[PDB]
Every structure is written in structure tokens, then in C-alpha cells.
Amino acid sequence: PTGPFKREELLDHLEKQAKEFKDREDLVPYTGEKRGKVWVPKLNSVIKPTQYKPVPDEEPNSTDVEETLERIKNNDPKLEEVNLNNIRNIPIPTLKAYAEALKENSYVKKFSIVGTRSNDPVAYALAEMLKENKVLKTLNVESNFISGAGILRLVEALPYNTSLVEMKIDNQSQPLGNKVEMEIVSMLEKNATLLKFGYHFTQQGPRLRASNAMMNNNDLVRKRRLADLT
Amino acid sequence: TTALVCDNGSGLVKAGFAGDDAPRAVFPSIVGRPRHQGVMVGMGQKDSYVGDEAQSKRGILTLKYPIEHGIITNWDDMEKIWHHTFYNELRVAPEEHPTLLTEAPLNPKANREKMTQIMFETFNVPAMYVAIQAVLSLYASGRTTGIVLDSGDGVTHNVPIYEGYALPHAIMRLDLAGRDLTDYLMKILTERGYSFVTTAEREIVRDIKEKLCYVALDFENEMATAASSSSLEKSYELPDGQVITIGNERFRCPETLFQPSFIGMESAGIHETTYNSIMKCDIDIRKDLYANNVMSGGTTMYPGIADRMQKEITALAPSTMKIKIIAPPERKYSVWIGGSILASLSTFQQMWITKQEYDEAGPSIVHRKCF
Amino acid sequence: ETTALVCDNGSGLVKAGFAGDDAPRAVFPSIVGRPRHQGVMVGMGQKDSYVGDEAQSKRGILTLKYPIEHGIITNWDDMEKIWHHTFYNELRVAPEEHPTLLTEAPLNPKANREKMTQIMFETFNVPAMYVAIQAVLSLYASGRTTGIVLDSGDGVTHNVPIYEGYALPHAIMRLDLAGRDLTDYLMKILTERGYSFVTTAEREIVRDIKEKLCYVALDFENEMATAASSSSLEKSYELPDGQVITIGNERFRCPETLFQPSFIGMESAGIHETTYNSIMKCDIDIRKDLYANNVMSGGTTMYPGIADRMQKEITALAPSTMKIKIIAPPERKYSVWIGGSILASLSTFQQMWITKQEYDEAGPSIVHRKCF
Amino acid sequence: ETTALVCDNGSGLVKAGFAGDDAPRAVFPSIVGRPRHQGVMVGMGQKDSYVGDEAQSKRGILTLKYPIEHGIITNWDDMEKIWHHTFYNELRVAPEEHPTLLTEAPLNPKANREKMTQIMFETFNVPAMYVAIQAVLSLYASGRTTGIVLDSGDGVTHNVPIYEGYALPHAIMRLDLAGRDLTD
Ligand SMILES: Nc1ncnc2c1ncn2[C@@H]1O[C@H](COP(=O)(O)OP(=O)(O)O)[C@@H](O)[C@H]1O
Ligand SMILES: Nc1ncnc2c1ncn2[C@@H]1O[C@H](COP(=O)(O)OP(=O)(O)O)[C@@H](O)[C@H]1O
Ligand SMILES: Nc1ncnc2c1ncn2[C@@H]1O[C@H](COP(=O)(O)OP(=O)(O)O)[C@@H](O)[C@H]1O
Ligand SMILES: [Mg+2]
Ligand SMILES: [Mg+2]
Ligand SMILES: [Mg+2]
């Protein structure tokens, strides 16, 4: 329209505008005058906290995203643990590529993507991956920006999966919603394999349904440990 | 005998006459004092400025906000705002007119007492009353039951109300409102290459906010549309004739209300605080709360905010619920409008605290009257 | 030869140590901290959490969650993190060669006890474990057999009366009002003086203010009038960033919610009324013995005005021909743990453990037939 | 008109109506509700107390008290409120021209019956009133003369045996365990 923004012209105009508005002289001055009736009725020490024992920091996650993705694509036998926690600026197609590559990988048993700003496409892709992959044991998607729809799709993948034992989904940026929570526990009652589900429920109903489902699955573990004892 | 209605907010004073359909005076809440660019505070020259004058000579005036997050904290500067409101904006003699004031949710007892003391002892008004903002909004809406979302320039509250009895334990306050949204819009315009960091430019930024921003129904879809095409962009003509183009800033800016991490602040969004407020209220009355979500205040004026709120509450609540969001077009001054309906009633005459009642009872009467 | 472990997992704090001692070895807050969603600090290459003191030290970039709400374990993975931290990081011990004693509040879900047994036997596998009621341990630490225990912690406040070793479960009372509610009320009422504490890192600051400066008034209205008259009850507190705040009546308005729950909108009665109602629901011939043996336990009972106030209120409610005695020892914050150390040291208790063979044979349901 | 009134004030419900009918006209819960929160909206037909169905409908902001506990009237002002409601608001009748029949559980205190008589004759003044045992009425409705009645309501559970119209008071049994205890 008018080309590149000329900030100096705007500032000059604004200052010109300000110069031309002088104040008015119709102000009744504030003197603090009381015109109504005044009503008449008829060792210190600053304890500072010091519980913060400064346990040291760690070392930033040195994983090479490209190299690791290449190893997962190559089905590298030496690669069992993939930890992509707290790595800055991982593209959404890169995470989707990770999820696509993990479908046929025979060797990665733990996968986590905490605090990588992952959203619903990533969760959808991971959901698709979980229907096919038969080796992955641990999935941690905590502390991201995945909505209720992504989580729903994830748990809708669970009856086509018999290998995952831990799903951590807690501390998403938005509450999942009561309706979604109901469909989630409903799906949890239709899988006998998952042993830990990381999520702070809001409603006591699904909370207890989930608790009973997990106790049931662990008791199936107990009973098969008892039956195989000759 | 005509009553006055003064609604003092964090950003704007709205003041006028009971019975009118809109406030006659609307002006910012900024006390402006001489700076030290040259010499000290000159004696005899006007030692303070309010509203428009303080928003004009801004460059040489330290601006203050006497009310901070809806609570009166500088009583001298409050009394100043009030004096200027009576004498220099409405142009009335206060002793001839009953004056209705508003207060924030969960305003401390001592503030109500001090407000009462100032109204009777300084300005010698014949009568006064103090009504709770959110309650006035629900009154104006025509209902006796609902949860108010009141969001202005400085503070947002959720106030659940059932059959005339508000619920103090369930009120939620979020310190995120219009001024934060202006700051965020300024930041992302600076990011795009429009560096509006002067106090002069601030007005322009506020105008862009009030005219071109909207709440997206599905944010990430909108972001993809804005990245994939120019179909959501708008031109804006600046006061000097320059024309700028803005894109996803239109809907990134009010998204902060739903996602406060955009400005750092780790609080829940207004949909989550709304839900949490409802969940602190007893199981029985909850259903009614869901059916009467009333939006009040200027920061609820963004197009599309009702549909987005409807979606988030719908997905956050049990499916069986009837969810309804009520967003009157006149909600920007609805509090004032509520006051206008309030004083105009034939039944309101005996509700005022009179001067004689104050002179007999003292500060006490404000709580010991209509609570 | 194998030393027994005593672990008390309350709503707010974990007190863990070895049996036969006098004080717990590890006392740490029961919180799990997770990364903030603000992308300020991404460089910290951790796993996915911080637990305990480490979470509290780094709280400026963390979101803090309590795994237990109102005495009920709501998240079990975070509970596993707490137990792993208190076994391997704090006590510096290997769990497979030490029996474990755990505690539970009365009128809790059965599933909580079952899953505690299941987690202790299948993930942190112990030779034996035993679950006990907290008020029985408090009475064990008090040295007597008959009494009514008011145990108030971070999530629950429960009254349990016991006469000659027999408990009366129909007179057990439970009130969901404890230290965290008082912390929230203090956060709400500090906004009256212009101080704004909102974030979970500032909640710990408010908790410290409550632990250091609050007390229970003997008469509420007289102390309010005294505070309104003169500034003799006002104390100053220094914030971590060097700011100094002054508080007056908020010192005693905060614990007064324990006697007037309607300050936070609850319809229930105060702790004195609840204690009197628990006494009146028992048999007539044991009430006298309950009157002389009011036993206070828990960290919420540590305010320096609460015994005299409770005695005054209960003496007002009870008949005038009765001796009302409040028993408030100085070490009552860790009475449950002390009782657990007493219980785990008895020679007559060693046949009441639940071995791994019994758990394998019976499953996670023997905890009702073996533990009270 | 002189058409007698029949009112049954149990621990949980009030069943009131006119004699000669088949079903009670007004069946409403025996509760009194009082507000516990702070009122902010003036007027709007706010009451300082609520009785019956109105208290049950608005129970989310009220504290509900039962005037009768285990068949014994513990609060008398609330009982006067219940009787005023069931005379003037529900049955829509004037009490001074209708005899009243009231019910009482066995083995109750005498003071309860005395104060019921005093209130019915000095505040809602009736030409006549009569107090009857509930189990005798239950046997009356069953159509027979001999039987043992187990009457269990909201506060009491009592057994009364009657043979050929003669009652045996030494075999009347009373247990303070009923619906409210099961609710608790
Ligand atoms: N059309 C609009 N779009 C977006 N924001 C608006 C619009 N109109 C007003 N606002 C914002 O609302 C604020 C006015 O709210 P106000 O009525 O003063 O609330 P209160 O006084 O209760 O705080 C202004 O500061 C402005 O930033
Ligand atoms: N000196 C004190 N004064 C008042 N309250 C205290 C004090 N010390 C601790 N507390 C409170 O006690 C609570 C926990 O006490 P305790 O019962 O030992 O832990 P838990 O509830 O986890 O079993 C904390 O929430 C804390 O606020
Ligand atoms: N269908 C039902 N099943 C079980 N209990 C019921 C049923 N209907 C009513 N009740 C119980 O009956 C009690 C009151 O019964 P009733 O004897 O008619 O009233 P009252 O005890 O006041 O005379 C109530 O406490 C209620 O819990
Ligand atoms: Mg306003
Ligand atoms: Mg405890
Ligand atoms: Mg009956």
C-alpha cells in the first residue's frame, strides 16, 4: 500500500499532535476541603527462609536428532533408549518422521519427548505408530501442548497394542475435559497390557475406573506369575 | 432529584446520570504529575492531570494508576479522580445528588469504610451506595443467577452468584486483562518490524486492538491459514496517512486470555478459571451456573470470544449440560448500565445510606445496611 | 539382623527412617516438580521431574504438584517417584533387604491400601510390609492405651477414639480441612494488605509465613479488638528478594478457620465441636476416660495457642463436673513415626508381617485380613 | 364445613390432607432451610427461611434442619413454621373450623405430646384435636383387626401387636434405627 513502514514520520506526526493539545483551565482545584460532618465515636527479627539447598544442575541433552533418526530408520540394534527431553526447536515434521520411523523399528524400548512443544499432529502420528509397533515399552509425552483430541486418539490406539506398559501424559497445558476423560477410562477398560497411566484425573468416577483397571492388569500379572510356578 | 452513577475501573472511569442509557463521561484513570525534565514542580501551575489531558502531555508527566487490579490503593489520588469527575467532567455540585459507586469483588471492609467516609465527609453528598460490579452486570442482564466473567483493563474476575446470594469462596481473580494484551500486541508488532514502543504510539496500538483483533475459534487452524495465505490480513491507516498490513497478530493477541504462557504468567486461562470457579460451587447449583455465563467488560468485546468460550466450556464440562454464553452488545458499559437501572427504581429510595444515618452510626452502616 | 524401615507418607510431607531410632532420618516435602511451560529454561537436560528438596530448590522454573490430595493418593506414578526418592536418594538404602511399615488415615479407600501393598511388593520389592492406622501409632507414642486422638496434617483432620485398645469405627470423624486450606486462606487474605502471592513458588513462602508467625487466639473477638486498637501484634517478615512485609490480625485469623470453617465457605463444624460429637457417639461409660485423654498429633497442631483454646472450648461444651485434659507433647509433629518405631521394635509384632510368599499365595487382598 | 384434617408429621416427610379421601393432598419434606452465604441482590422475593419443596429446590445455598429427630420434636419454632406452611400454604385452609388428627410414635416423651396440644390449641386454635399411635392407624388401613405392625419410617422403627382390638403395651418394641441412619 504505502511501502515499508517509516517510523520517523509517524513519531514526528505524533509529537506534532501532542504539541497541539494544551491543557484546559476549567479545573476546579483539589484542596482537600472537608465539607461534611466528621464522625466522632461516642525483639523484632526478620526470619528469612533458607531451605533452598542448591543441588547442582545437569548437562544439556546431547542427543543428535538427525543421527538418532537415521539410526531408527536403519533399525540399529545398538539403539534402545531415545531421550529427546528438553531439546529446543525440534520441527513438527521431524517429530512426525520419528513417529513414522518407529513403526517398523524393532529395537527402541523407551521413547520420551518431554517439553519439546509437541502438539496434536505429533500425538496423531504416535497414535498411528502404536497400532503397529510391537517392541516399545515406555512412552512419555508429559509437559507439551497436546490437546484432548490427541490424547483421545492415543488411547483409542491402545486395544491394537500389546507391548506398551507405561504412558505418561500428565501436565499438559490444558485440562483434557470430563467427556474425554470418560472415553479415556472406557478405552483403558478395553486393554489388559498397560500397567501405569500418568495422569491427574479430576472426576472421582473415571479416577476409580482407572485405578481398578490398573489393579486388574497388575493382578493378571500376579496370577500368571503364580500359574507359571509349576 | 437525579442520581449519579460512577463506575471506577482499573483503566477507565465511567460516570454519568441515572436513567440515561449510556455514560456521559468516559475517561482514563491516570493521575499525571510533572516530571524533572527541566526544573522542579512549579508552584501555582496545575499539580495533577486526569484522563485526556494526562494522555496528551504524557511525555513530561509521570502517569499513575490510583486503582490497581480493581482495589483502591492511593486514597489521595482516588479522591482526586472523584473530585475531577464531579466538578470537571459531569459539571455538577455533588451535595445536590445521590451518588452510586462500584467496587471490585472481595474488596476489603476497610476500603468500603474509607470510600464511605470520603463520600460523606469530603464531598457532603446527600446519599450514597456501593454495589458489587459483577452483581450489577448480572442485574443489568435481567437474571438473578449466573457466573459473571468481568474482564476490563487491569483485572479479570469470575464471580458465581445464585438467587441473590453471591459466593465469596468461589470467586477467582486473574491479573491478566487489556493492558497486558496491549503490551503483547506491541511486542509482536515490534517482532514484525513495527516498533511501537513510544507512549505516543500506545494509543495507535490500543486502536488497532479494539478495531481489528478477534478471537479465533480454533487457534492452530487459524495460524495455518494465516501462514498459508494472505486471506486473514488487514490494512490499517495510521494517523499520518501511512498504511500498514497486519496478519496473525489479530488473533495471537487475545489468545493470551486463553493461553497466559504467551506473556509468561503461569496462571490458568479464563476458560479454566471459569470451570474451576464453577467446580468450587456446590453440586446442586452448578447446572444453573452453566446456563448463565454472562460476559461483562471491554476485554470481552472481541468478535468470536463467545463461540470460543462455548467450545472450551462445552468440552470441559459433562456432555449432558446445556451450555449457554450470553454476550450483550452493550456489555462494554453494562456495569454502569446496571447502576442506571439500579438507582432509577421506585424501591431504591429507602436503600441509600443517608447523611443523618452516617452522622449517627459512623463507617459501620456500610456493612450494617445492605451488606 | 534385618533392620525395619518406618515410612510415613502424609499429604504434605514424607517422614522416613529406620526402626529403633528417636527421630526420622529424612523429612522432606511430598511434592513432584515438572518443567514449566514458559520456554525460559530448556537447557536443563533432566529426565522429566524433580522430587522433594530438589524440586523446592529449583521451584522458580518448575510447576509443583502434590501426589496426595485430602489424604488420598491421586497419582501413583508420582507416588512411585516419591518412594524411589526416599529409598535410593534420601535413606541411601536398598529396599530388598528391609521390611517396611507404612501408615494410612482412617476411612480411606481400600484400593489405596491394596495398591500400596502391590507397589511395595512388585516394584520396590520388600521381604515384608505392614500398614497401620496413624492414630493408633500416635497413641503408641503417647505411652497410653485409652484416649481420643485428633490427628490433623496437610490434607485431613480426623478424630479417632480408642478405649483399652479397642477402636470404635462408628465414632471416627473426618474433616477435609487441614494445613493446605489454611495456606490457601492465608494467600487469599494477604491480598487485603496489597501483597500478591499467586504462583506455587509463592505458596511455599506463604506456608513459611504460616509456620513461623501464626498462632491461635484464646478469645478471637478480644484479640481482633486489640489488633484494631494498637500495633503490638504486628510482625515483619523478609521476603526472598529482600522485601519486608508486616502482618497484624492475619497471624490469628488464619488458624481460626480450624474452629470456624465458614470463613472458607464450609458448612461443617469446628474441631472442638467435631471432637465433642465424636465423644458423644461413644458409649456413656468411656466418655470420662476420653475426656481426660485428648491427644493432639500432627503438624497442624503446632500453633502455640491451640491446646488452651481446645481446652476452653471443650470445657464449655462438656459438663462442669469433668476433667478435660489436652495432651500436647513438644515432639508431636513426628508422633506417628515415633509410634511406628515403637511398633516395629516390639518382639510380639514380628509374627504379624506379610511375607512375600503370603502375598504371592493370596494376592493384594490379604491386607484386610492381616492389617487393621 | 367441619371436614376433619389428617396430618402425619414423621421424621422425614409431612403427609397432610382431608378426612374421607384415599391419598394425602400435600406430601412434602419436613425440612427448614436457612441461608448461609452473603446476599447481594435486593428484593427478588428473598425469604429469611424456606420450608418444604422450596427449600429442597434451593438447597444448594441453604442449610437444612430437620425439626424432628427420632420421632421427637427438637426445635419448636421450625415445627410451628412447618404447621403454618401445611395449614395456610399447602392445604389452603383456615385451621379454626377444622378438627385435626395428629400421629405420634410409641414410647415418646410426654412433654412432646403436651406441647403439641398446647401449640394446636393456643396458636393455630382448632375446635378439637386428637393424637393417635401410628401402628394402630396402619392396622386400620390394612382392613383387619388382629396383627403385629412393624412401622419403620425416617426416625424410628416400632413393633406393636394388637389382638381383637386390644393392644399389649408391654410387648411394644422400639428401635432408633430407620432411614436417616441408613442415609448416614
Ligand atoms: N472493541 C474492543 N476490543 C478489544 N478490547 C477493547 C474493546 N473495547 C474496549 N476494550 C478494552 O477494554 C478496556 C475497557 O474496559 P473497562 O470497561 O474500563 O473495564 P473496567 O473498568 O471494569 O476495568 C479498555 O482498556 C480497552 O483496552
Ligand atoms: N510450626 C508450625 N506451625 C503451624 N503449622 C505447621 C508448623 N509446622 C508444620 N506445619 C504444617 O504441618 C503440615 C504437615 O504436617 P505433618 O502432619 O507432619 O505432615 P503430613 O500432613 O504430610 O503428615 C504442613 O502443611 C505445615 O503447613
Ligand atoms: N423407594 C424407597 N426405598 C427405600 N426407602 C425409601 C423409599 N421411599 C422412601 N424411602 C424412605 O422412607 C423415609 C420416610 O418414609 P415415611 O415413613 O413415609 O416418612 P416419615 O418417616 O417421615 O413418616 C425416607 O427417609 C426415605 O429414605
Ligand atoms: Mg468496570
Ligand atoms: Mg499424617
Ligand atoms: Mg412415618
PDB file of N, CA and C in Angstrom, chain B residues 206-263:
ATOM      1  N   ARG B 206      -3.645   0.536  20.891  1.00  0.00           N
ATOM      2  CA  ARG B 206      -4.947   0.288  21.511  1.00  0.00           C
ATOM      3  C   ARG B 206      -6.054   0.331  20.462  1.00  0.00           C
ATOM      4  N   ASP B 207      -5.944   1.268  19.511  1.00  0.00           N
ATOM      5  CA  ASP B 207      -6.952   1.425  18.467  1.00  0.00           C
ATOM      6  C   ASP B 207      -6.954   0.222  17.527  1.00  0.00           C
ATOM      7  N   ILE B 208      -5.752  -0.260  17.147  1.00  0.00           N
ATOM      8  CA  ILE B 208      -5.607  -1.477  16.337  1.00  0.00           C
ATOM      9  C   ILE B 208      -6.256  -2.654  17.051  1.00  0.00           C
ATOM     10  N   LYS B 209      -6.013  -2.754  18.370  1.00  0.00           N
ATOM     11  CA  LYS B 209      -6.572  -3.818  19.205  1.00  0.00           C
ATOM     12  C   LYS B 209      -8.098  -3.786  19.167  1.00  0.00           C
ATOM     13  N   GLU B 210      -8.684  -2.601  19.388  1.00  0.00           N
ATOM     14  CA  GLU B 210     -10.137  -2.502  19.501  1.00  0.00           C
ATOM     15  C   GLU B 210     -10.836  -2.622  18.150  1.00  0.00           C
ATOM     16  N   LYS B 211     -10.128  -2.409  17.038  1.00  0.00           N
ATOM     17  CA  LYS B 211     -10.790  -2.393  15.735  1.00  0.00           C
ATOM     18  C   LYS B 211     -10.557  -3.651  14.909  1.00  0.00           C
ATOM     19  N   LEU B 212      -9.401  -4.309  15.023  1.00  0.00           N
ATOM     20  CA  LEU B 212      -9.047  -5.345  14.065  1.00  0.00           C
ATOM     21  C   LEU B 212      -8.809  -6.719  14.676  1.00  0.00           C
ATOM     22  N   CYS B 213      -8.690  -6.827  15.993  1.00  0.00           N
ATOM     23  CA  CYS B 213      -8.406  -8.102  16.637  1.00  0.00           C
ATOM     24  C   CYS B 213      -9.685  -8.916  16.816  1.00  0.00           C
ATOM     25  N   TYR B 214      -9.527 -10.238  16.889  1.00  0.00           N
ATOM     26  CA  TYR B 214     -10.652 -11.138  17.119  1.00  0.00           C
ATOM     27  C   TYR B 214     -10.108 -12.428  17.713  1.00  0.00           C
ATOM     28  N   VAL B 215     -10.989 -13.189  18.353  1.00  0.00           N
ATOM     29  CA  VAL B 215     -10.617 -14.474  18.935  1.00  0.00           C
ATOM     30  C   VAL B 215     -10.915 -15.570  17.920  1.00  0.00           C
ATOM     31  N   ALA B 216      -9.895 -16.353  17.574  1.00  0.00           N
ATOM     32  CA  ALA B 216     -10.092 -17.474  16.666  1.00  0.00           C
ATOM     33  C   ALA B 216     -10.819 -18.615  17.366  1.00  0.00           C
ATOM     34  N   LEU B 217     -11.695 -19.296  16.623  1.00  0.00           N
ATOM     35  CA  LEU B 217     -12.410 -20.434  17.193  1.00  0.00           C
ATOM     36  C   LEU B 217     -11.494 -21.639  17.383  1.00  0.00           C
ATOM     37  N   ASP B 218     -10.616 -21.897  16.415  1.00  0.00           N
ATOM     38  CA  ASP B 218      -9.574 -22.920  16.513  1.00  0.00           C
ATOM     39  C   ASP B 218      -8.254 -22.251  16.140  1.00  0.00           C
ATOM     40  N   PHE B 219      -7.441 -21.954  17.164  1.00  0.00           N
ATOM     41  CA  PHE B 219      -6.239 -21.125  17.031  1.00  0.00           C
ATOM     42  C   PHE B 219      -5.234 -21.679  16.021  1.00  0.00           C
ATOM     43  N   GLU B 220      -4.827 -22.946  16.178  1.00  0.00           N
ATOM     44  CA  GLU B 220      -3.765 -23.516  15.345  1.00  0.00           C
ATOM     45  C   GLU B 220      -4.173 -23.637  13.875  1.00  0.00           C
ATOM     46  N   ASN B 221      -5.448 -23.961  13.616  1.00  0.00           N
ATOM     47  CA  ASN B 221      -6.009 -23.883  12.265  1.00  0.00           C
ATOM     48  C   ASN B 221      -5.900 -22.476  11.693  1.00  0.00           C
ATOM     49  N   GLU B 222      -6.280 -21.468  12.496  1.00  0.00           N
ATOM     50  CA  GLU B 222      -6.182 -20.070  12.076  1.00  0.00           C
ATOM     51  C   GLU B 222      -4.737 -19.695  11.760  1.00  0.00           C
ATOM     52  N   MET B 223      -3.786 -20.203  12.562  1.00  0.00           N
ATOM     53  CA  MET B 223      -2.367 -19.918  12.354  1.00  0.00           C
ATOM     54  C   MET B 223      -1.888 -20.532  11.046  1.00  0.00           C
ATOM     55  N   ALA B 224      -2.392 -21.736  10.733  1.00  0.00           N
ATOM     56  CA  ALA B 224      -2.049 -22.401   9.479  1.00  0.00           C
ATOM     57  C   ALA B 224      -2.623 -21.643   8.289  1.00  0.00           C
ATOM     58  N   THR B 225      -3.863 -21.147   8.433  1.00  0.00           N
ATOM     59  CA  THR B 225      -4.490 -20.341   7.388  1.00  0.00           C
ATOM     60  C   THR B 225      -3.705 -19.052   7.162  1.00  0.00           C
ATOM     61  N   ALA B 226      -3.296 -18.392   8.258  1.00  0.00           N
ATOM     62  CA  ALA B 226      -2.553 -17.137   8.168  1.00  0.00           C
ATOM     63  C   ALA B 226      -1.169 -17.358   7.568  1.00  0.00           C
ATOM     64  N   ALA B 227      -0.597 -18.549   7.773  1.00  0.00           N
ATOM     65  CA  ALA B 227       0.715 -18.854   7.226  1.00  0.00           C
ATOM     66  C   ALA B 227       0.629 -19.301   5.776  1.00  0.00           C
ATOM     67  N   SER B 228      -0.537 -19.785   5.345  1.00  0.00           N
ATOM     68  CA  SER B 228      -0.684 -20.409   4.039  1.00  0.00           C
ATOM     69  C   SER B 228      -1.226 -19.449   2.990  1.00  0.00           C
ATOM     70  N   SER B 229      -1.682 -18.269   3.404  1.00  0.00           N
ATOM     71  CA  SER B 229      -2.387 -17.335   2.536  1.00  0.00           C
ATOM     72  C   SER B 229      -2.402 -15.976   3.221  1.00  0.00           C
ATOM     73  N   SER B 230      -2.784 -14.955   2.458  1.00  0.00           N
ATOM     74  CA  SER B 230      -2.968 -13.614   2.993  1.00  0.00           C
ATOM     75  C   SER B 230      -4.422 -13.307   3.323  1.00  0.00           C
ATOM     76  N   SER B 231      -5.282 -14.335   3.382  1.00  0.00           N
ATOM     77  CA  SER B 231      -6.733 -14.151   3.430  1.00  0.00           C
ATOM     78  C   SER B 231      -7.226 -13.521   4.731  1.00  0.00           C
ATOM     79  N   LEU B 232      -6.416 -13.526   5.789  1.00  0.00           N
ATOM     80  CA  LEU B 232      -6.827 -13.007   7.084  1.00  0.00           C
ATOM     81  C   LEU B 232      -6.172 -11.675   7.411  1.00  0.00           C
ATOM     82  N   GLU B 233      -5.358 -11.142   6.507  1.00  0.00           N
ATOM     83  CA  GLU B 233      -4.625  -9.914   6.764  1.00  0.00           C
ATOM     84  C   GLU B 233      -5.543  -8.706   6.639  1.00  0.00           C
ATOM     85  N   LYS B 234      -5.190  -7.638   7.346  1.00  0.00           N
ATOM     86  CA  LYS B 234      -5.914  -6.380   7.264  1.00  0.00           C
ATOM     87  C   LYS B 234      -4.930  -5.231   7.132  1.00  0.00           C
ATOM     88  N   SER B 235      -5.318  -4.231   6.354  1.00  0.00           N
ATOM     89  CA  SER B 235      -4.598  -2.973   6.316  1.00  0.00           C
ATOM     90  C   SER B 235      -5.149  -2.024   7.369  1.00  0.00           C
ATOM     91  N   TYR B 236      -4.278  -1.149   7.857  1.00  0.00           N
ATOM     92  CA  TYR B 236      -4.648  -0.152   8.848  1.00  0.00           C
ATOM     93  C   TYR B 236      -3.970   1.156   8.486  1.00  0.00           C
ATOM     94  N   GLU B 237      -4.764   2.215   8.389  1.00  0.00           N
ATOM     95  CA  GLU B 237      -4.253   3.529   8.036  1.00  0.00           C
ATOM     96  C   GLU B 237      -3.864   4.242   9.324  1.00  0.00           C
ATOM     97  N   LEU B 238      -2.607   4.648   9.412  1.00  0.00           N
ATOM     98  CA  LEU B 238      -2.096   5.349  10.573  1.00  0.00           C
ATOM     99  C   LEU B 238      -2.528   6.819  10.513  1.00  0.00           C
ATOM    100  N   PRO B 239      -2.468   7.562  11.641  1.00  0.00           N
ATOM    101  CA  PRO B 239      -2.901   8.982  11.630  1.00  0.00           C
ATOM    102  C   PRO B 239      -2.147   9.901  10.661  1.00  0.00           C
ATOM    103  N   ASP B 240      -0.961   9.511  10.195  1.00  0.00           N
ATOM    104  CA  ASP B 240      -0.159  10.311   9.284  1.00  0.00           C
ATOM    105  C   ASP B 240      -0.324   9.874   7.831  1.00  0.00           C
ATOM    106  N   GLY B 241      -1.284   8.989   7.560  1.00  0.00           N
ATOM    107  CA  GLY B 241      -1.580   8.521   6.225  1.00  0.00           C
ATOM    108  C   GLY B 241      -0.870   7.254   5.797  1.00  0.00           C
ATOM    109  N   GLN B 242       0.178   6.841   6.512  1.00  0.00           N
ATOM    110  CA  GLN B 242       0.821   5.556   6.255  1.00  0.00           C
ATOM    111  C   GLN B 242      -0.144   4.395   6.477  1.00  0.00           C
ATOM    112  N   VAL B 243      -0.012   3.359   5.652  1.00  0.00           N
ATOM    113  CA  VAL B 243      -0.853   2.170   5.726  1.00  0.00           C
ATOM    114  C   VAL B 243       0.039   0.970   6.012  1.00  0.00           C
ATOM    115  N   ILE B 244      -0.282   0.232   7.071  1.00  0.00           N
ATOM    116  CA  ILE B 244       0.455  -0.971   7.433  1.00  0.00           C
ATOM    117  C   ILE B 244      -0.441  -2.181   7.206  1.00  0.00           C
ATOM    118  N   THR B 245       0.189  -3.348   7.124  1.00  0.00           N
ATOM    119  CA  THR B 245      -0.512  -4.614   6.965  1.00  0.00           C
ATOM    120  C   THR B 245      -0.199  -5.476   8.177  1.00  0.00           C
ATOM    121  N   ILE B 246      -1.243  -6.029   8.793  1.00  0.00           N
ATOM    122  CA  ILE B 246      -1.110  -6.945   9.917  1.00  0.00           C
ATOM    123  C   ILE B 246      -1.810  -8.257   9.591  1.00  0.00           C
ATOM    124  N   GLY B 247      -1.255  -9.341  10.126  1.00  0.00           N
ATOM    125  CA  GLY B 247      -1.719 -10.682   9.833  1.00  0.00           C
ATOM    126  C   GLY B 247      -2.142 -11.396  11.098  1.00  0.00           C
ATOM    127  N   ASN B 248      -1.399 -12.432  11.509  1.00  0.00           N
ATOM    128  CA  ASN B 248      -1.798 -13.298  12.621  1.00  0.00           C
ATOM    129  C   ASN B 248      -1.814 -12.623  13.998  1.00  0.00           C
ATOM    130  N   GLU B 249      -1.307 -11.379  14.103  1.00  0.00           N
ATOM    131  CA  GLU B 249      -1.360 -10.581  15.330  1.00  0.00           C
ATOM    132  C   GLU B 249      -2.789 -10.301  15.763  1.00  0.00           C
ATOM    133  N   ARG B 250      -3.722 -10.282  14.796  1.00  0.00           N
ATOM    134  CA  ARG B 250      -5.139 -10.081  15.072  1.00  0.00           C
ATOM    135  C   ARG B 250      -5.649 -11.127  16.055  1.00  0.00           C
ATOM    136  N   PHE B 251      -5.228 -12.389  15.888  1.00  0.00           N
ATOM    137  CA  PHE B 251      -5.762 -13.426  16.759  1.00  0.00           C
ATOM    138  C   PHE B 251      -4.752 -14.033  17.719  1.00  0.00           C
ATOM    139  N   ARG B 252      -3.447 -13.838  17.497  1.00  0.00           N
ATOM    140  CA  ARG B 252      -2.463 -14.193  18.519  1.00  0.00           C
ATOM    141  C   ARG B 252      -2.672 -13.391  19.801  1.00  0.00           C
ATOM    142  N   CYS B 253      -2.993 -12.093  19.661  1.00  0.00           N
ATOM    143  CA  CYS B 253      -3.100 -11.176  20.799  1.00  0.00           C
ATOM    144  C   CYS B 253      -4.163 -11.588  21.830  1.00  0.00           C
ATOM    145  N   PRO B 254      -5.466 -11.743  21.502  1.00  0.00           N
ATOM    146  CA  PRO B 254      -6.411 -12.126  22.571  1.00  0.00           C
ATOM    147  C   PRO B 254      -6.330 -13.586  22.991  1.00  0.00           C
ATOM    148  N   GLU B 255      -5.592 -14.428  22.238  1.00  0.00           N
ATOM    149  CA  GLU B 255      -5.333 -15.828  22.598  1.00  0.00           C
ATOM    150  C   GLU B 255      -4.667 -15.953  23.967  1.00  0.00           C
ATOM    151  N   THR B 256      -3.908 -14.918  24.367  1.00  0.00           N
ATOM    152  CA  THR B 256      -3.251 -14.812  25.667  1.00  0.00           C
ATOM    153  C   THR B 256      -4.245 -14.992  26.817  1.00  0.00           C
ATOM    154  N   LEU B 257      -5.494 -14.510  26.638  1.00  0.00           N
ATOM    155  CA  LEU B 257      -6.554 -14.713  27.632  1.00  0.00           C
ATOM    156  C   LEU B 257      -6.802 -16.196  27.896  1.00  0.00           C
ATOM    157  N   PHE B 258      -6.723 -17.017  26.849  1.00  0.00           N
ATOM    158  CA  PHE B 258      -6.900 -18.457  26.952  1.00  0.00           C
ATOM    159  C   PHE B 258      -5.594 -19.201  27.205  1.00  0.00           C
ATOM    160  N   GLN B 259      -4.455 -18.620  26.816  1.00  0.00           N
ATOM    161  CA  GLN B 259      -3.125 -19.216  26.996  1.00  0.00           C
ATOM    162  C   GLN B 259      -2.150 -18.203  27.591  1.00  0.00           C
ATOM    163  N   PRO B 260      -2.198 -17.975  28.916  1.00  0.00           N
ATOM    164  CA  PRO B 260      -1.379 -16.908  29.539  1.00  0.00           C
ATOM    165  C   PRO B 260       0.137 -17.090  29.457  1.00  0.00           C
ATOM    166  N   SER B 261       0.638 -18.287  29.106  1.00  0.00           N
ATOM    167  CA  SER B 261       2.076 -18.513  28.942  1.00  0.00           C
ATOM    168  C   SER B 261       2.696 -17.678  27.823  1.00  0.00           C
ATOM    169  N   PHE B 262       1.875 -17.136  26.908  1.00  0.00           N
ATOM    170  CA  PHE B 262       2.347 -16.242  25.851  1.00  0.00           C
ATOM    171  C   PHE B 262       2.999 -14.987  26.431  1.00  0.00           C
ATOM    172  N   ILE B 263       2.580 -14.557  27.625  1.00  0.00           N
ATOM    173  CA  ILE B 263       3.175 -13.398  28.280  1.00  0.00           C
ATOM    174  C   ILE B 263       3.939 -13.820  29.522  1.00  0.00           C
TER     175      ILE B 263
END
